[PDB]
Design a protein around this ligand. Structure first.
Ligand SMILES: CCCCCCCCCCCCCCCCCC(=O)OC[C@H](COP(=O)([O-])OCC(O)COP(=O)([O-])OC[C@@H](COC(=O)CCCCCCCCCCCCCCCCC)OC(=O)CCCCCCCCCCCCCCCCC)OC(=O)CCCCCCCCCCCCCCCCC
Ligand SMILES: CCCCCCCCCCCCCCCCCC(=O)OC[C@H](COP(=O)([O-])OCC(O)COP(=O)([O-])OC[C@@H](COC(=O)CCCCCCCCCCCCCCCCC)OC(=O)CCCCCCCCCCCCCCCCC)OC(=O)CCCCCCCCCCCCCCCCC
Ligand SMILES: CCCCCCCCCCCCCCCCCC(=O)OC[C@H](COP(=O)(O)OCCN)OC(=O)CCCCCCCCCCCCCCCCC
Ligand SMILES: CCCCCCCCCCCCCCCCCC(=O)OC[C@H](COP(=O)(O)OCCN)OC(=O)CCCCCCCCCCCCCCCCC
Ligand SMILES: CCCCCCCCCCCCCCCCCC(=O)OC[C@H](COP(=O)(O)OCCN)OC(=O)CCCCCCCCCCCCCCCCC
Ligand SMILES: CCCCCCCCCCCCCCCCCC(=O)OC[C@H](COP(=O)(O)OCCN)OC(=O)CCCCCCCCCCCCCCCCC
Ligand SMILES: CCCCCCCCCCCCO[C@@H]1O[C@H](CO)[C@@H](O[C@H]2O[C@H](CO)[C@@H](O)[C@H](O)[C@H]2O)[C@H](O)[C@H]1O
Ligand SMILES: CCCCCCCCCCCCO[C@@H]1O[C@H](CO)[C@@H](O[C@H]2O[C@H](CO)[C@@H](O)[C@H](O)[C@H]2O)[C@H](O)[C@H]1O
Ligand SMILES: CCCCCCCCCCCCO[C@@H]1O[C@H](CO)[C@@H](O[C@H]2O[C@H](CO)[C@@H](O)[C@H](O)[C@H]2O)[C@H](O)[C@H]1O
Ligand SMILES: CCCCCCCCCCCCO[C@@H]1O[C@H](CO)[C@@H](O[C@H]2O[C@H](CO)[C@@H](O)[C@H](O)[C@H]2O)[C@H](O)[C@H]1O
Lengths: 82, 99, 174, 171, 95, 97, 52, 347, 96
C-alpha cells in the first residue's frame, strides 16, 4: 500500500524515469523467465563457421556417422520446426 | 582505390567550390581563459567518457552470436547499468544543471 | 607504387608527429595530431583492421580530439600565433623533416636502412598472410570475444570509466 | 638448415574443375552428398599431416570425383542445372533463397535421373568418421626430444637443523 | 603474478589472452601457432635459466616466424642478384 | 624489421622528445602525450593484426579507452590550472620549488 | 603450493610451543603497544583499559 | 569529499594496486597502474589550493609519461616474443624502457625531482599514501622482471638515489620534503639488493612502509608540517617526542632498532656475492640520512625549544585525532630486531 | 514478426555455410597445388639467379625444424608482376 502510493506519485511526476526503470527491469528479468532463451544458445551452436574435421575411424564409434546423410549425429529437425 | 577516389573527389570538389567562391571579377578599380562556464567543459568531458563506453558497446551485435550467451548478456547489461549509474551520479550531484 | 602505400602513409604519419611535436600553437598542434590520426587509421586499415581503424576516427578523432580542441578554445588559445613564427618550432620542424627525409631516401634506394636498428625496405606486403578464406572477420571475432572471454576486462574497464566520472567531478568542483 | 623438398611441376598436374563459383554454389549440396568419401579422406589427411606435400595423392582423387560428379550432371540434367546456377549467378550475394523455383527443377531432375537426394539442413556440417589405410602420423610437428624435468624432490620434511642458523640466533 | 590468486582460486582472470596458441574464437589459429606451441612445450616446467639454453632452437624458430628477419634477408639477396643480372642481360624472367 | 615499424617507432620517439622538451602551453604537452598513445595504438594493432592473434584484437581498444579517460583527467587539471593563473603556461607551476 | 600461507606439507613439522621464547617476546611487544596506546591518549598507563 | 566517495576512491586506489600484483598479463598490469593513478589524483586535490593543483599536475605528467613508456616496453616485448605474460622480458630495449618507466613511477633518482614537490604540495594523509602504498605496485613488477634487468642500470639508479636522497635531505626544514628525500634514499637500498636477493627487497620495503607510516601518523596527530612546528610537541605531548625520537633513530639504521635489520640483511646478501665496495659505499652514504634524522631529534626531543603563550590554551584539550594503529606501528618500527629470522616468511 | 524472420534468416545462413563446407575440400586441394607450384617455380628461378653465388645453397630453409611452414607473401609472389602482388595483397581490403 505504501509502495502503491509511491508508484502513483512517480508516474504523475516522472513518467519518463518510471518507464526507463521498468524497461530496464524487464531487460534484466525476462531472459530468466522466457522459455525461448534456451533456443538462442542452440541456434548459435548449430551455425558451422569452421570446417567439421572428420575423425579417424577406429571401429568403436557407433555414434559418429560415416556419411552426412546417415542417421547418426546432431540433428536440426528441431530448428526447422522452430 | 574506389573509396580513395571517392574521398579525393568529394574534398577536391569542396576545395574547388571554396576557391571559386573566394575569387570572382569584382569590377572594382579602387591565449587565455574564455569567460565561458565550467559547465560547458563538463559537458565535453561527460560526452567523452560516455563516448568511450559506447565504444565498448559497439561489438554487441557480433557478441550476440557467441555460445556463451549467459556470460555475454550479463556483461552487456553490466556495462549499460554502470553507464546509467554514472548518469545517475552526475544527475544527483547537480552536474546536469545550468543555474 | 601502390605496393608501398603503407610505407607512404607511415612517412606522412611521422611528418604529422614532427608537426605537433615541435609544438606550434596548440590549435595547429591539434591539427597536426588530427592528420596523424587519420593517417594512423589508414595504416591500420591496410593491415585488415577495419573495425580498429574506424575506432580511431570515432573515438580518437571524433571524441578525444574534439574535446581537446574544445578545451583549447576555452582555456588555452582562441587566436593562433603565425605558424612557424617562432625560431624554436621552425628549427625543430626543419630538424625532424630532414631526419625523416634522410631515413626515407636511404631505405628506398637500398631497400633496407640501418637507423640504429636494422629495417628492411622490400615492402610491407612481403610479411602478409598468404592463405585466407574464412567466412568472417577474424578481427571482428576477437573484439566480440571481449564479452565471452574478457569478463575481467569488462569489469575493470567499466569500473575505471565510472571512477573517471566521479573523479573529474571532484577535481573540478573547487 | 636443410633444403625444402618440393614436388616436381609434373607431380602437381591434374585436370582442374574449371567452373565458376556460382556453378559450384548451385551444385554444392548434391556435391557434398555424392563426393563425401574422397573429400573427407583428403581433409582427414590435411589435418593429420599438416603438410600439403603429404596429401597430394588424395587431393587428386578429390578432383577426379568432382569432375565425375559434373560429367554426370552434364549427361542427364544439363538444362535444369544451367537455369539454376544462372539464377544464382545473377545475385550479388549468390543467394539460395532467390532461386527456389529453379532449385526445385534441378532437384527433381537429379532425383529422377540419378537418385540423388539433397542433404537436409544440418547434415553437411556433421562430423563424420573416415576409414583410411594411411598410417596415423607419429611426429606431425617434427619436434625434437623434450628437455628432461628437474630432479623431483620427495622425502620427509624434518625441522630445520638448528633453526634458521642466521648469525647468532638459536631458533 | 606477485600474488597468484588466479591459480589458487582456480579462476581465469587474464591467462586466456597471454599467449597466441591458447583457445581462440572459432578455432582461428595465429600464424605462428605451431612455433609458439613447440617452444612452450619444450620450455615447460624447467625454468627460464635452463630454457634459455636448452630450448634455444625452438625460440629461434619461433622468433623467425614472428619477425621473418632471416626470410626477408634471403629474399632481399635473391632480389639483389636478379635486378643486377638483368642489367648485364644475363637473365630473362619466365612468362 | 618491416619498414612501417621504422616510422611508427620514430613517431613515438618524436612525440616523446616533444613531451620532454616543454615549451609554455601545458596543452602542447598533453598533445604530445596523446601522440605517443596514437603511435602505441598503431604499433600494437599492426603487430596483432599481422600475427593473426585473434583474442588480442580487443587490446588496442582497451588501450584507447583507458588513455582517453587518462587524457580527460589531464584536461581537467589543465582547466583548473588555467582557472588559477588565466593561462596554461607551465612556468606558473613553480610554487613548489 | 601457490599463494598459500601454510601449505599442507607443513603439518608434518612439530608446532611451535605455546611457551616459545619468541612467542613470549611477541606477547611482550603486544603489551608494550597497550601501554603506548594509553600514553598517547593520556590515560593511566598501567591501569587504564585492562580489557584493551 | 563525501565520506562514501572518499572510501570508494580509496578502494579504487587499492584495487589498482591489487590488479598489478595478481595479473599475469601485461595489459592488466598497465590497467592497474592507470586505475591507480586515476583514483589518486582526487586525494591530492582534496584541499583545493594552487599548491595542490600544481602537485597533482606534476604528478599526472610524470606518471602518465611513465605509463606510456611501460606500454611501449610491453609492445616491444610482444613484437619479439608474441606473448603478454608478466615475467622476464624478451628484448633488451624493452627491459631498459620498463626499468626506466618503473624508476620514474618510484621516483628514484635521477627521475626523483617530482617526489619532494608533490609530497610538499599535498596533505599529510595523501603524502602517507604517496610514499608507502604507491611503492607496492612498481616494486611488485620489479620483483618479477628482475632476471632480464640490466645490472649496471639498476645499480646506477640505486647508487644515485642513495646519494641524492642523502644530500637532498640535509637542506630541508619542511617535514614533507624530509620524508620525500628519505623515501628516495630508501628506494635505493631496495633496488640495490633486487638483482641478488628479491626477498631482501620485500623485507626493506615492508619495514620502510611501517616506519614511514609511523612518522606520517605522528606528524598528523599534531598537525605538524615544519621543523619548528614539530619543536613545540614537547610542551603539549611529551610522549610523542619520545616515539618520534625512537622512530627516527630506527629510520637511521641504528642498532638495536628495527631499521637496522634491512640494511644489515642487504649488506649480507651483497657480500655473499663478493660485492664489498658497493655495500660499504652505501652504508657510509646512509650516514647522510642519519645526520638529518638526528637534527630532528635535537629540535624535537633532546632539547626544549622556545614556546608561545597561546600554547597554554592547548593544554586544556585532548588529542582527538584517530592515530589509527600508531601504538602497533611504533612498536614494530623499533623493537623487531630480535625477530629478524622471521624474514623467511617472505621467501 | 522479427523473431519469425530472424529464425528463418538463421536457417538460411546455415544452408549457405553448409554449401561452403561442401566445397572446402575441393578448394583446399586446389590451393595446395597452387602454393606448391608457385614455390617450385620460385625455386627454379633461384637455381638460375644464384647458380654460383659464393656459398649459396638453393632452396635452403631458414628454420631449424623440417616441419612444413606456410610461406608468406614475399616467398610466393616475391618474383612476380606487381599487379598480381597488389591484387594478392591489398585486393580484398580495397574491394569494399
Ligand atoms: C612463555 C613462557 O612462559 O616461557 C618462555 C621462556 C621459556 O622458554 P625456554 O624454552 O625455557 O627457554 C628460555 C631461555 O631463556 C632461552 O632459550 P633459547 O635457547 O631459545 O635462547 C633464546 C633464543 C630464542 O630466540 C629468540 O630470539 C627469542 C628472543 C627473546 C627476547 C630477546 C629480546 C630482548 C633483547 C634483550 C634486551 O634467542 C636467540 O636465539 C636469539 C638471541 C637473542 C639475543 C637478544 C638480542 C637479539 C637482537 C639484537 C637487538 C636487541 C639487543 C638487545 C635489546 O621464558 C622466557 O625466557 C621468556 C622469553 C623472553 C622474552 C619475553 C620477555 C620480554 C623481555 C623484554 C626485555 C626488555 C628489554 C629492555 C631493553
Ligand atoms: C609476529 C610479528 C610481530 C607481531 C605482529 C603483530 C601485528 C599486529 C597484530 C594485530 C594488532 C591489532 C591491534 C591490537 C588490538 C588493540 C585494539 C583493542 O584492543 O581495542 C579493543 C576494540 C576497541 O577498543 P577501543 O577502546 O575503541 O580502542 C582500542 C585502540 O585504541 C584502537 O587503536 P587503533 O585506532 O589503532 O585501532 C586499530 C584496529 C581497530 O580496533 C579494533 O576494532 C579491534 C580489532 C582487533 C583485531 C584483532 C587482530 C588480531 C586477530 C587476527 C585475526 O584495527 C583493526 O581492526 C586490527 C585488525 O574492541 C574491539 O573491537 C574488539 C574486536 C571486535 C572484532
Ligand atoms: C622495553 C620497553 C619498551 C618501551 C615500552 C613502552 C613504553 C610504555 C611506558 C609509557 O609509554 O608510559 C610512560 C609512563 C608515564 O607515566 P604517567 O604518569 O602515567 O604518564 C602517562 C599519562 N598517560 O610511565 C609509567 O608511569 C608506567 C610505568 C612503565 C614506564 C616504562 C618506561 C619506559 C621507558 C623505555 C625506555 C627504553 C627502555 C630500553
Ligand atoms: C603496516 C602499515 C599500517 C599503516 C596504517 C596507516 C593507518 C592510517 C594512518 C593512521 C592515522 C589516522 C588515519 O586514519 O590516517 C588518516 C588517513 C585518512 O585521511 P584523513 O585526513 O585523516 O581524513 C580523510 C577525510 N578527508 O588515512 C588514510 O588515508 C590511509 C592511508 C594509509 C594507507 C597506506 C598504508 C601503507 C600501506 C600498508 C600496506 C602494508 C604492506
Ligand atoms: C626489546 C628489544 C628492542 C630493543 C630496542 C629498543 C626498544 C626501545 C624503544 C621503544 C620505542 C620507544 C618507546 C619508549 C617509551 C617512552 C615512554 C616513557 O618512557 O615516558 C615518556 C615520558 C612521559 O611523558 P608523559 O606521559 O606525556 O608525561 C609525563 C608525566 N608523568 O615523556 C617525557 O617525559 C619526555 C622526557 C623528555 C625526553 C627524554 C628523551 C630521552 C629518553 C628517551 C628514551 C627512549 C629512547 C628510545 C631509543 C632506544 C633506547 C635503547
Ligand atoms: C621480522 C621481519 C618479517 C616480518 C614479515 C611480516 C610480513 C607479513 C606476513 C606475510 C607473510 C607472507 O606470507 O607474505 C609473504 C609474501 C611472499 O611474497 P610473494 O611475492 O607472494 O612470493 C614469495 C616467493 N618467494 O609477500 C608478502 O606478503 C610481502 C609483500 C607485502 C606487500 C603488501 C601488499 C598488501 C596488499 C594487501 C591487499 C589487501 C588490503 C589489506
Ligand atoms: C530495476 C532494475 C533495472 C536496472 C536499473 C539500472 C540501475 C540505475 C541506478 C540509478 C539509481 C538512481 O537512483 C535515484 O537517486 C535519486 C537521488 O536523488 C532518487 O531521487 C531522490 O533525489 C532527488 C534529488 O534530485 C529528489 O528530487 C527526489 O525527490 C528523491 O526521491 C531516486 O529515488 C532514485 O531513483
Ligand atoms: C551493477 C551490476 C549489474 C549486473 C546486472 C546483471 C543482470 C544479468 C541478468 C540476466 C543474466 C542471465 O540471463 C539469462 O538467465 C537465465 C537463467 O537461467 C539463463 O538460463 C536460461 O538460458 C539457458 C541457456 O541454455 C537455458 O539452459 C536455461 O534453461 C534458461 O533458464 C540464460 O542463459 C541467461 O541468458
Ligand atoms: C570493481 C569490481 C570488482 C569485482 C571483481 C569480481 C571478480 C569477477 C571475476 C570474473 C572472472 C570469473 O571467472 C571466469 O569467468 C569467465 C566467464 O564466466 C570464464 O571464461 C569462460 O568464457 C570463455 C569461453 O571459452 C573462456 O574465457 C573460457 O573458456 C570460459 O571458462 C572463466 O572460465 C572464469 O575463470
Ligand atoms: C626512450 C627512447 C625510446 C625509443 C624507442 C625506439 C624503439 C626501439 C625498438 C627496439 C626494437 C629492436 O630491438 C633490437 O632489435 C634487434 C633485432 O634482432 C635485436 O638484435 C640485435 O641484438 C642482439 C644481440 O645479441 C641480437 O639479436 C643481434 O646480434 C642484433 O641484431 C636487438 O637485441 C634488439 O634490442
Amino acid at each position: 500500500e505504501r509502495v502503491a502510493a509511491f508508484l502513483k506519485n512517480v508516474w504523475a511526476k516522472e513518467p519518463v524515469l518510471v518507464a526507463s526503470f521498468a524497461i530496464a527491469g524487464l531487460a534484466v528479468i525476462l531472459p530468466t523467465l522466457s522459455p525461448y532463451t534456451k533456443y538462442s544458445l542452440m541456434i548459435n551452436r548449430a551455425t558451422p563457421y569452421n570446417y567439421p574435421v572428420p575423425l579417424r575411424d577406429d571401429g568403436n564409434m557407433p555414434d559418429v556417422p560415416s556419411h552426412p546423410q546417415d542417421p547418426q549425429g546432431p540433428s536440426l529437425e528441431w530448428l526447422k520446426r522452430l | 582505390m574506389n573509396l580513395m577516389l571517392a574521398l579525393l573527389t568529394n574534398f577536391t570538389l569542396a576545395t574547388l567550390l571554396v576557391i571559386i567562391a573566394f575569387w570572382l571579377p569584382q569590377l572594382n578599380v579602387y591565449s587565455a581563459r574564455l569567460p565561458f562556464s565550467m559547465k560547458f567543459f563538463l559537458v565535453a568531458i561527460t560526452f567523452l567518457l560516455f563516448d568511450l563506453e559506447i565504444a565498448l558497446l559497439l561489438p554487441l551485435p557480433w557478441a550476440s552470436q557467441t555460445a556463451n550467451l549467459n556470460t555475454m548478456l550479463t556483461m552487456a547489461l553490466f556495462l549499460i547499468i554502470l553507464l546509467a549509474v554514472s548518469l545517475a551520479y552526475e544527475w544527483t550531484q547537480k552536474g546536469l544543471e545550468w543555474t | 607504387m601502390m605496393l608501398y602505400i603503407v610505407f607512404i602513409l607511415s612517412v606522412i604519419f611521422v611528418m604529422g608527429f614532427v608537426g605537433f611535436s615541435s609544438k606550434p600553437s596548440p590549435i595547429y598542434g591539434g591539427l597536426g595530431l588530427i592528420v596523424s590520426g587519420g593517417v594512423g587509421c589508414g595504416i591500420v586499415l591496410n593491415f585488415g583492421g577495419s573495425f580498429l581503424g574506424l575506432m580511431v576516427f570515432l573515438i580518437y578523432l571524433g571524441g578525444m580530439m574534439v574535446v581537446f580542441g574544445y578545451t583549447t578554445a576555452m582555456a588555452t588559445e582562441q587566436y593562433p600565433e603565425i605558424w612557424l613564427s617562432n625560431k624554436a618550432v621552425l628549427g625543430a620542424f626543419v630538424t625532424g623533416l630532414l631526419m625523416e627525409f634522410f631515413m626515407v631516401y636511404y631505405v628506398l634506394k637500398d631497400k633496407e636502412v640501418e637507423v640504429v636498428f636494422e629495417f628492411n625496405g622490400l615492402g610491407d606486403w612481403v610479411i602478409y598472410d598468404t592463405g585466407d578464406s574464412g567466412f568472417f572477420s577474424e578481427e571482428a571475432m576477437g573484439i566480440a570475444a571481449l564479452y565471452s572471454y574478457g569478463t575481467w576486462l569488462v569489469i575493470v574497464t567499466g569500473w575505471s570509466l565510472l571512477i573517471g566520472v566521479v573523479v573529474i567531478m571532484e577535481i573540478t568542483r573547487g | 638448415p636443410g633444403i625444402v623438398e618440393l614436388p616436381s611441376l609434373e607431380d602437381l598436374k591434374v585436370q582442374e574443375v574449371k567452373v565458376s563459383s556460382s556453378v559450384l554454389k548451385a551444385a554444392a549440396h548434391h556435391y557434398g552428398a555424392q563426393c563425401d568419401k574422397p573429400n573427407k579422406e583428403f581433409m582427414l589427411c590435411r589435418w593429420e599431416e599438416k603438410d600439403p606435400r603429404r596429401c597430394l595423392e588424395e587431393g587428386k582423387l578429390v578432383n577426379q570425383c568432382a569432375l565425375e560428379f559434373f560429367r554426370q550432371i552434364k549427361r542427364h540434367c544439363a538444362e535444369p542445372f544451367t537455369e539454376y546456377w544462372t539464377c544464382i549467378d545473377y545475385s550479388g550475394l549468390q543467394l539460395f533463397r532467390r532461386c527456389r523455383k529453379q532449385q526445385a527443377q534441378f532437384d527433381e531432375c537429379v532425383l529422377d535421373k540419378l537418385g540423388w537426394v539433397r542433404p537436409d539442413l544440418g547434415d553437411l556440417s556433421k562430423v563424420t568418421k573416415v576409414k583410411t589405410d594411411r598410417p596415423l602420423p607419429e611426429n606431425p610437428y617434427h619436434s625434437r626430444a623434450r628437455p628432461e624435468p628437474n630432479p623431483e624432490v620427495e622425502g620427509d620434511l624434518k625441522p630445520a637443523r638448528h633453526g634458521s642458523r642466521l648469525f647468532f640466533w638459536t631458533m | 603474478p606477485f600474488f597468484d590468486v588466479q591459480k589458487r582460486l582456480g579462476v581465469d582472470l587474464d591467462r586466456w589472452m597471454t599467449i597466441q596458441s591458447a583457445e581462440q574464437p572459432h578455432k582461428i589459429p595465429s600464424r605462428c601457432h605451431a612455433f609458439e606451441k613447440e617452444w612452450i612445450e619444450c620450455a615447460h616446467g624447467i625454468g627460464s635459466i635452463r630454457a634459455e639454453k636448452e630450448c634455444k632452437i625452438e625460440f629461434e624458430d619461433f622468433r623467425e616466424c614472428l619477425l621473418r628477419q632471416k626470410t626477408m634477408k634471403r629474399l632481399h639477396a635473391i632480389r639483389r642478384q636478379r635486378e643486377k643480372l638483368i642489367k648485364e642481360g644475363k637473365y630473362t624472367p619466365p612468362p | 624489421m618491416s619498414m612501417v615499424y621504422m616510422n611508427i617507432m620514430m613517431a613515438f620517439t618524436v612525440s616523446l622528445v616533444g613531451l620532454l622538451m616543454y615549451r609554455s602551453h601545458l596543452m602542447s604537452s598533453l598533445l604530445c602525450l596523446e601522440g605517443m598513445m596514437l603511435s602505441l595504438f598503431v604499433m600494437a594493432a599492426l603487430t596483432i593484426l599481422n600475427s593473426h592473434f585473434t583474442l588480442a584484437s580487443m587490446m588496442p581498444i582497451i588501450l584507447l579507452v583507458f588513455a582517453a579517460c587518462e587524457a580527460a583527467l589531464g584536461l581537467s587539471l589543465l582547466v583548473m590550472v588555467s582557472n588559477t593563473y588565466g593561462t596554461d603556461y607551465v612556468q606558473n607551476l613553480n610554487l613548489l620549488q | 603450493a601457490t599463494f598459500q600461507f601454510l601449505p599442507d606439507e607443513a603439518r608434518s613439522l612439530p608446532p611451535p610451543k605455546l611457551t616459545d621464547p619468541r612467542l613470549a617476546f611477541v606477547g611482550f611487544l603486544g603489551y608494550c603497544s597497550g601501554l603506548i596506546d594509553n600514553a598517547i591518549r593520556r590515560r593511566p598507563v598501567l591501569l587504564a583499559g585492562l580489557h584493551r | 569529499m563525501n565520506p562514501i566517495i572518499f572510501i570508494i576512491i580509496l578502494l579504487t586506489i587499492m584495487l589498482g594496486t591489487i590488479i598489478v600484483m595478481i595479473s599475469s598479463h601485461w595489459l592488466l598490469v598497465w590497467i592497474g597502474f592507470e586505475m591507480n593513478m586515476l583514483a589518486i589524483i582526487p586525494i591530492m586535490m582534496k584541499n583545493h589550493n594552487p599548491r595542490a593543483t600544481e602537485a597533482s599536475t606534476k604528478y599526472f605528467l610524470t606518471q602518465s609519461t611513465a605509463s606510456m613508456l611501460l606500454m611501449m616496453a610491453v609492445i616491444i616485448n610482444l613484437m619479439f616474443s608474441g606473448q603478454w605474460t608478466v615475467m622476464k622480458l624478451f628484448n633488451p630495449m624493452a627491459s631498459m624502457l620498463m626499468t626506466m618507466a618503473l624508476a620514474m613511477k618510484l621516483g628514484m633518482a635521477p627521475f626523483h625531482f617530482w617526489v619532494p614537490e608533490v609530497t610538499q604540495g599535498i596533505p599529510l594523509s595523501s603524502g602517507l599514501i604517496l610514499l608507502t602504498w604507491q611503492k607496492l605496485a612498481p616494486m611488485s613488477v620489479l620483483y618479477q622482471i628482475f632476471p632480464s634487468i640490466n645490472l649496471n642500470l639498476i645499480l646506477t639508479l640505486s647508487v644515485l638515489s642513495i646519494l641524492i636522497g642523502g644530500w637532498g635531505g640535509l637542506n630541508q626544514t619542511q617535514l614533507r620534503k624530509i620524508m620525500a628525500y628519505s623515501s628516495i634514499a630508501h628506494m635505493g637500498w631496495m633496488t640495490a639488493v633486487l638483482p641478488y636477493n628479491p626477498t631482501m627487497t620485500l623485507l626493506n620495503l615492508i619495514i620502510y612502509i611501517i616506519m614511514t607510516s609511523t612518522m606520517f601518523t605522528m606528524f598528523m596527530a599534531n598537525s605538524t608540517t615544519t621543523t619548528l612546528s614539530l619543536s613545540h610537541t614537547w610542551n603539549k605531548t611529551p610522549i610523542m617526542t619520545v616515539l618520534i625520537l625512537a622512530t627516527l633513530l630506527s629510520m637511521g639504521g641504528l642498532p638495536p632498532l628495527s631499521g637496522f635489520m634491512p640494511k644489515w640483511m642487504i649488506i649480507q646478501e651483497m657480500t655473499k656475492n663478493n660485492s664489498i665496495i658497493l655495500p660499504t659505499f652505501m652504508a657510509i652514504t646512509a650516514l647522510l640520512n642519519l645526520y638529518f634524522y638526528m637534527r630532528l631529534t635535537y629540535s624535537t626531543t633532546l632539547t626544549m625549544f622556545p614556546s608561545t603563550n597561546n600554547m597554554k590554551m592547548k593544554w586544556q584539550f585532548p588529542l582527538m585525532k584517530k592515530m589509527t594503529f600508531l601504538p602497533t606501528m611504533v612498536v614494530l618500527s623499533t623493537m623487531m630486531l630480535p625477530l629478524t629470522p622471521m624474514l623467511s616468511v617472505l621467501e | 514478426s522479427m523473431m519469425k524472420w530472424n529464425r528463418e534468416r538463421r536457417r538460411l545462413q546455415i544452408e549457405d555455410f553448409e554449401a561452403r563446407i561442401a566445397l572446402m575440400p575441393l578448394l583446399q586441394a586446389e590451393k595446395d597445388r597452387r602454393v606448391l607450384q608457385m614455390l617450385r617455380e620460385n625455386l627454379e628461378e633461384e637455381a638460375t639467379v644464384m647458380k654460383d653465388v659464393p656459398g649459396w645453397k638453393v632452396g635452403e630453409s631458414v628454420f631449424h625444424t623440417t616441419r612444413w611452414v606456410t610461406p608468406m607473401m614475399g616467398e610466393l609472389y616475391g618474383l612476380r608482376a606487381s599487379e598480381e602482388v597488389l591484387s594478392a595483397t591489398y585486393g580484398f581490403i580495397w574491394y569494399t
